[model samples]
Target: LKAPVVVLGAGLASVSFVAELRQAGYQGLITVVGDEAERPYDRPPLSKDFMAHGDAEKIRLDCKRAPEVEWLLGVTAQSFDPQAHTVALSDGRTLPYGTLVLATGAAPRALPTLQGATMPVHTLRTLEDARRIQAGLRPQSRLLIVGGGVIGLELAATARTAGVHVSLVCRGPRLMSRAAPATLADFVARYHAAQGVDLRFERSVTGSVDGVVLLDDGTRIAADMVVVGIGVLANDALARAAGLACDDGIFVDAYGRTTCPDVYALGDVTRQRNPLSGRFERIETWSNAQNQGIAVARHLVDPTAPGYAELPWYWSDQGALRIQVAGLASGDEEIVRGEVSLDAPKFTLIELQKGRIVGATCVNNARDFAPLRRLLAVGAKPDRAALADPATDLRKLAA
Candidate 1:
């Protein structure tokens, strides 16, 4: 098959890129290759809603606007030949392309050194994995989750709701250590504990046996099933094998252009230079994937199009809390605005650096978050005093 543009991976990035291309008036032939059999879908709800309800339809992203693109699903791209501009598939099919976009995304990192880890261990990366885990959830099941990241916590919450016992084991001292501070982490730990989750902080798993998890502290916990959620490692092995500038991920510029000509990368697969922070970073959020994919699509259709410059935003739903975040907050001075009330479940926290809003995290504050996202989109400055005021209406801040 020959196409003007070819996208590898049928994940969020690939579908978004193709849709953006059609939206931007690119009528050229497009081909998308995916290893999974299912169509493009959102991954965020896999550990939450999809895991709990087995609703596969909820995550599917059907490209209703752009129907010209050819989808090659359930076939893996075996190799790439840049000189010949061809991609070899596992089924012995070859695809020729003028421009190639790598959006393979990432895979769940697992603990290989642990004993008995190979048997019946679950990792929430794909929809199939979610289905398998959800089917295994039973009222009497004791679940051991390795890694206290967002996915682990979300899965724990879901399993807990199903009357299953959940024990979260993390090597780090706090839940969401990279994202949340000590206080917020403590709050999460207490909250989960109060809800009947066995929250184990600062503990590492040495190994596992049949229905038992061995910790580094020489303690063993009984578990009927185990789920590993130690974050993701970029899907850069294929890029690396193709001799591209892949460091942790495919290295790309702010415009999503890689070292190779007519080749670009986006989403979790690209460790690109972020225009907002002026630093090379890999963002794994859905918003970043969608925006970056669109940016790359526009750039591909027209090189003269404006360079990709958009703030990153993300959201997570944990039980009753609708956590939303805008902007990147690394090396920023965090400010906890609006006192959190157990009685009232709405609060906003702003992260600032040198008197400028860099990031904001809001819980059940969609009214506040909506304006904050808009301000972030337009690069508007936020008033610290007004933001700090609990009585202040956040929607007015944008005005």
Candidate 2:
């Protein structure tokens, strides 16, 4: 059966797009192609809850909204012919489509140095990856994570709770250097240290031999399992081969349209314009995947529908630390709302650019996060004294 619309990748972006299509009264045939055999699942918990306890059922994404859509699971799109408007699948089938959407998402970047390691070295990006990581997490086991980013830190925290010894090695000077501000990173580093995690910053894994990892400092640490969470690269091979404009990620407009007509890309695989940076960059977050999928679907149904311009935000849970960051990480002016020390970690760091609220980083301060996020969304510049006052009601301030 020839579907009118064919979407590559069966993750949140594809499912959200399909759900919105039916919700917007689009009854045309739709087909989704995914490499993974499992149905669409939430990925946030993969490093946190799912890694701690292998409960696959709890992380399943509800597909009730897109009931009749065809799901070609366990098969991957190998190539795409833009002129022919068809995709060649790994199963040796060429499927023609009136419109094509690329949402293959991204894959974890592997460590070349540790590639030949005989021990269990893994990366956390998919459900299967999480499963493999969980299986290796035994009480008193050694878990050496390479990177201080979201995935690495989250897994380290999870492993610590599971009674597994965690040693995190980061090439950078601080944790979450690219994501969070310096203050927040310092607090997080302290928190992780307090939890008995071996924090090794500005260190690199030179090599490994005999169940021992060699750091750049010539230090050897024995690790039962190693996990690399450096980062991810977009799955844009098909688009690039089709002669579509792509640089690691497929170039997409606000409507998720690629360079080629009727061909679109969304989610982690797209390099769309960052509203904050004003430059094309890949937004690898759950919110972007779901929102951009719905936005693209709405645009398809109603040509005049507004483009997606939601502010970039991300929430990551590492043990008891519930860190949420919105908009840009740094600003000209910074304000501390409450106690920010490790002993008292409940606070909101507000950032301002010439008195205009630009960003907020909340640490176990959801009450402040909601209001600060709302203010940033609306470009509200509340009084600095009121914002810094922990007693001040942020909702009332926003109103």
Candidate 3:
């Protein structure tokens, strides 16, 4: 390598890229700059097992792939000068780059009311945040969670199981408005209800009076601890300041190429083109972060290799139910298979557009997913009658 390759964030995306780069025979000088001192760790567990169990050792990310790379931990990337190909850090240091990877990542969103409010409002994005929430959460405590998204719901499940009285408030009609279909949301509501979570629908927090929240719908809830998992905003200020294309997130192509020359972006900070939706989106899933970084590293060494165009998939382990969705989750047309019996909730919802398989979702059904995903991957859509029929063998149909 001519010069040192600089990775902007020390999160999974940057670490994974460096690991893959080393695997591809890149042994040049590498520097990883991150603001977190704990190195890269698994973020998904912070909202689930790690948060509940307080096992910091188990959550640490594996760094076996990393060689002797310079790590600047607990420091922020202040600004980037694309013209000079340099990045300025918060410690008044400027560094040049051979190839700059902007894995800046994202930060949790804070509710406007909790901006400077004297209340116990927490957002679970970093390990530090998880530690605070974990310390605050206890048995017989009242936990109030805002937003019915994946993070909020996961915490709700965890908290309820821990003997905490949980009250979940959602602005939408149900949980995961954008992510889950109405029927799935209905099922989730019932499941959460069964688990004894106080599901407050169509509610928004107007203000918080020291852990006590008042909803816009004229309802008040008392909480010992409050956690808001509404969403996240991308850390794209440095990219935008450097004149890279950004809209909510830094725009990157299949090869993780930023608008500026020799600059690239990945992970939650990127608004890359979605092959299924044909639109640019910030896919903040764990799989995307891992796989996209791997794809970019391969493409970086061999330009002829395919760009990062993996079909998106997301899974949620809410309580006892295991929900897996591959391809487009929602579409103009949806064809359902199997019965939604909680004893054995088995269903494969095939989403169609232009008379083809666009997406499929498997709820507590692993067997149906294999054939359904295969059928969609190869552009082969089985007959509607057979697809909807519970008696039909989906595996045979795919073959």
Candidate 4:
């Protein structure tokens, strides 16, 4: 079938793009090709609720109703010929498009050489991955998580709820080393430990065999299941092979327009320039993918459309602690706050560079997050003395 717009990968980005196109009054044929057989669905729940309770029904997209876009599910895009403006599918079908949207997200990194690797090693990226991991969680299962990033920590929280013994092994200095500060990481480490999780920092896994994980220090930990959440690598092989500009991810501008004419990339697959940070960054979060998808759709409907420059936001649920972060923070900044108690379950910490608020992290404090997000959206400077004032209301500061 011929279409004016073709979107690859039926993840959140692709579905959102279609919805945005409809909203923007685009009546052209919009075709979407997804490798998964099922309809497009939300992926955040996969590493949280779905990983804990084997629930596939809860992982569906909020599409209001079934989209009108033509769907070609259960098929993979084999190759793309930009010069010919055609895409070749694995099923021997060739499709032509006036404009192409590359929303092929990322895949989970794995350790294949480890012993017991043939066993049911889980990697939570899709709904199917979550189902496999959830079904494998037994009452007394000993789970060894190989990474301490968001996915690993979220899974650890869920596994602890199932009464499973969880050991988090991170080669870095702390949990979420790249995302959180040392103080916040310390809090997370202690929080997980309090929830009966065996938190191992500065530890690396050498190998694994028969329900046992060997550390680099030669310490062996018993495990019945292993979940790897090291990181992700972009699915840009198709873009690179097709001669599109790719640096870590498909290079795109503020409007999600790639180097190739009539070609755009969004979501986790696009490495676009950040107007606020003055650097190129590829974000892997639900908000980024959705916003960028809408931006690309708007641009297609109107080439002179305003560019999107939203601040990055993300959240993680670890046991009872709801950790939320707004904007990006470099490690060299000093973290300041009004009141932070190790015993208190709720608090807010702001990352400062010289005297400006570059980032903010909230723990179990949703009230503070609303303003934090707003303040960063407008690029407001932080008043050091006022921000550290115990009596000052943070919401007012955000305004």
Candidate 5:
């Protein structure tokens, strides 16, 4: 085939892009190159439900409409010959691309000290990683988690339900410092603790022993399995070497256009403009991958189409509590609507800047999420006094 349109990752971004192209009547050569052997699958389940149960097939991305796809599985891109419009693969092959797409995503970062731990360390990224972690979650098994973020917290909650003893270690005082509001963080910390998870904050993992982990305080705890969710680094090394603009991630436009012409980018590897921060950030959420992919495809098909600027939102289920975060995480001021407390399971926290809603958080409060999100989308300035009352109807407030 004459140089195909090469998609450089097989996750949601690549799959969605390909599917959208086929839907928009692009019948040209399309090839998807991925480092994983398995077909593209949903990743969110890896740390949550998939960890509790090994249902790999259930989490598969429905890419049945990806027409004329040449999936080059389990092969790494060694080098990029940008001038020649070619990519060198680890499988001893060089392929030319009419258009290049870099959606390689990010890899989980690990602590240097736990390099040679006797116990196996699991980081949820791929289906295989999740399966490996699932295998370790036996009854009464001890799991030592090394981060207080969503991934680590979700896994801890899931493991606890599976009868696995969980000990969470975090550098911060509360759960998800940057991701959630302080009050919500405190609620989650208490929620997990009540579920029998031993949470240790303001601590660091120094080293490991014979299947035991050593904290900075020199406390030795025997761990059957260790799961680290310290964070992630973008897979932008190849893009960086190719002389593209990069800062932790390859910077991309709304249409996923990189600095170089004909070489576009999307997903976790891209550091696109954050509507809240006003700086380039890697939005590593499932919604972003799907939306941005489709947005880029629309731009590719119809140049006149408007760029993607969807409202950013993400959700996590820590046992029974369904935590939802929408828009920016912080603002100049915080306003609480509905009942917000550790005792109260459901509530809404609205953030205001310049007297307009900029951010919101919902904990088991889905009834108000739709109207509240609509209000944020339209920059509504509702009465704070009315919002403070839990009895106030959010839909009426938005109207």
Candidate 6:
């Protein structure tokens, strides 16, 4: 075997992989290359608590388990030579590896209209991005947030909490269209609205001029700062240049095998087969990064181990609402577990597909969230009446 395993992108996935490999008693050298100078940190809180506290230590990922791993920070993998298994770095050095791991992750898509605006325009993906946005946020400042997705909404909640007036604009008709069902989206939107966040749906920022943002709906919003959280695209350019199979994200099987042998991809960069959807999809959640990276590392250690096929799920803490979603958002039938009104918000909206539990959205219902998620993982279909009843113990059904 070659001396060192070279991993591109030193984010959560890379750290988890290296840590797992070392813990699994892999004696070979491990080298991780990251484009960012900052040590690998958890990103989920960048939009939430990190903004309020600016605590980097709380978010920094622990790599003590992989103490011997060489870290190439503030450098990127410029190019790859799969034939020779060598990766050229932006720092004018090349790394030869026994195995290559692509964990380049994804980059937030920038809004063209906001590019070169005189006012502060930003995207929340990196720690530097969060710092810039934090500096721009002042009490009573007007914040124009584009996109009603998780990132945008979380930022809105954070900014609003900091006494910044927030206006959230979404190109879609509802908030969280990609992740949450209409019922849950509406519930979240109302919560934000109640908290004084100006919600504008079916609109986009066409242009920014005179420190104001021009909307497609002919509305002018004056802003102290603008944050675009539209979405992210996979950082698969290097993979594509190396002639690896890529569709936005690198194509990988359940075992994390790329089109080329000994060159595997993980995290947000790999689009793998979703057991639930049975389609190639990128799982971008924090859990995916941790679980998939660990699973891939374990698989590399033992071939017969199970592949990375965990259930797809994510959580968003917006204002007072803690939204937990598992499985598909859309289904043939929607079941209401408890009260979903703004006044009484504790409830779980379960989605059933062809008599099986396919998905669930739990709002402020942590007790039932994991149990329902477990049920969804096994495609369980308990009695509808019992499912709807708050008295029923979901744990028993999940068991």
lDDT of 3 by residue, 269-350 (tens): 9999888778888998887898899899889877888999787778887777778777776777888886766665667788
lDDT of all predictions, in order shown?
Answer: 0.80, 0.90, 0.85, 0.81, 0.86, 0.90
Write model 1 residue lDDT over 130-233, tens digit each, in one string: 88888889997899889988888888888888899988898977787755545455666766787788888778988877667789889998887889999899
lDDT of 5 by residue, 50-164 (tens): 7876778888888888867999999988878788999999999988898899989999998898998777987888888888888889989999999899998899889988999
TM-score of 4: 0.94
State the local distance difference test value for candidate 5.
0.86
lDDT by residue for model 2 over 54-81, one digit each (tens)? 8999999999999789999999999988
Cα RMSD (angstroms) for every candidate in the order listed? 2.1, 1.6, 1.8, 2.2, 2.0, 1.2
Write down the TM-score for model 2. Answer: 0.97
Error of 6 at 202 (Å): 0.6
Candidate 3 ranges beyond 4 A from true positions: 391-397
What TM-score against the true fold does each predicted structure earn? 0.94, 0.97, 0.95, 0.94, 0.95, 0.98
* Candidate 2 global Cα RMSD: 1.6
Candidates ranked by TM-score, best first? 6, 2, 5, 3, 1, 4
What's model 5's TM-score? 0.95
What is the number of backbone collisions in each predicted candidate, taken in the order shown? 0, 0, 0, 0, 0, 0
Per residue, candidate 4 scores C-alpha lDDT tens digits across 1-399 of: 124888899899888888998888787878888999887789888767777666677777876532578889999998888889988998899889888899999988876546445445777888778777888788888888988898989988988898888988898878887657666788888888888888887888887766677788889878777888988888998999988999879999877888888788999988987755778888888888999898888877877888777778788888788999877655346545545555767878877655556678889889888887787677667766777776778888775
lDDT preference between candidates 2 and 3, better one: 2
Candidate 6 lDDT, tens digit per residue, 1-399?
245799999999999988988987788989999999998898988999999999898999999988799999999899989999899999999999889999999999989888879988889999999999999889999999999899999999999999999998899889998868889998898899999999998998899888999999898999888899998999999999999999989999877889987899999998988787788888898888888999999888877889887988999998789999998987899999888788857988999988899899998899889889889988998888888888888888787
lDDT at residue 367 of model 6 (Cα atoms): 89
- In model 4, the Cα lDDT at residue 142 comes to 88
Q: Is candidate 2 or candidate 4 better by lDDT?
A: 2
Model 1: pairs clashing at backbone N, Cα or C within 3 Å: none
